[PDB]
Every structure is written in C-alpha cells, then in structure tokens.
Amino acid sequence: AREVILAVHGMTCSACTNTINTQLRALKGVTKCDISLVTNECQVTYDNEVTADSIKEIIEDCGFDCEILRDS
Ligand SMILES: [Cu+2]
C-alpha cells in the first residue's frame, strides 16, 4: 500500500466530501481515506487492486473535477 493525493475541485461542503470519502471506503483496495476541504485534495491509502486511476474516476463521477496530483 501507499497514499495518493487527488487534487479535487468543485466540492465545497460536508455532504460532498462525506459522499466522496464514503465512496473511496466502498471500492476494494482502499485501506484509509482522509478528505480535506482545506487543501482541496482527497488523500486515499490504496494497496494495488484499486489505484488513483479508478479513484479519480469515482471522485469525478461523484460530480466534480479532480486529478491525481501526486503520491501522498
Ligand atoms: Cu457540496
């Protein structure tokens, strides 16, 4: 496992960030998941089965604009 940062834009509320971290929690290969309305990134700890690639997509689908900014 490792951490990845998704820089995440659009979301600005508890409902959205809750919705986000909730989804990350419910993928497969996600160990930990800590979102921040301060930095406007989502930090997620993944193993292998799920990557920043899928995570990006999940996080986009939630209804916002994000990208894999960097590992951790
Ligand atoms: Cu919102």
From Swiss-Prot:
Domain of life of the organism encoding this protein: Eukaryota
Question: Which cysteine pairs are covalently linked by disulfides here?
Answer: none
Q: Where does Cu(+) 1 bind?
A: C13, C16
Disruption effect? Impairs iron uptake. Impairs the production of inositolphosphorylceramide D. Leads to slow growth on ethanol. Also leads to slow growth at neutral or alkaline pH.
Gene induction: Expression is induced by the iron-sensing trans-activator AFT1.
**Compartments it resides in:** Golgi apparatus, trans-Golgi network membrane
Residue ranges of every copy of the HMA domain listed in the record: 2-67
| Known function | Copper-transporting P-type ATPase necessary for the proper uptake of iron. Required for export of copper from cytosol into extracytosolic compartment. Retrieves copper from the metallochaperone ATX1 and incorporates it into trans-Golgi vesicles where they are acquired by the cell-surface iron transporter FET3. Required the production of inositolphosphorylceramide D, probably by delivering copper to a yet to be identified enzyme.
Q: Which family does it belong to?
A: Belongs to the cation transport ATPase (P-type) (TC 3.A.3) family. Type IB subfamily.
Describe its assembly: Interacts with the copper chaperone ATX1 via the copper anion.
Its protein name is Copper-transporting ATPase
Organism of origin is Saccharomyces cerevisiae (strain ATCC 204508 / S288c) (Baker's yeast)
Q: Give the shown range, full length included.
A: 1 to 72 of 1004
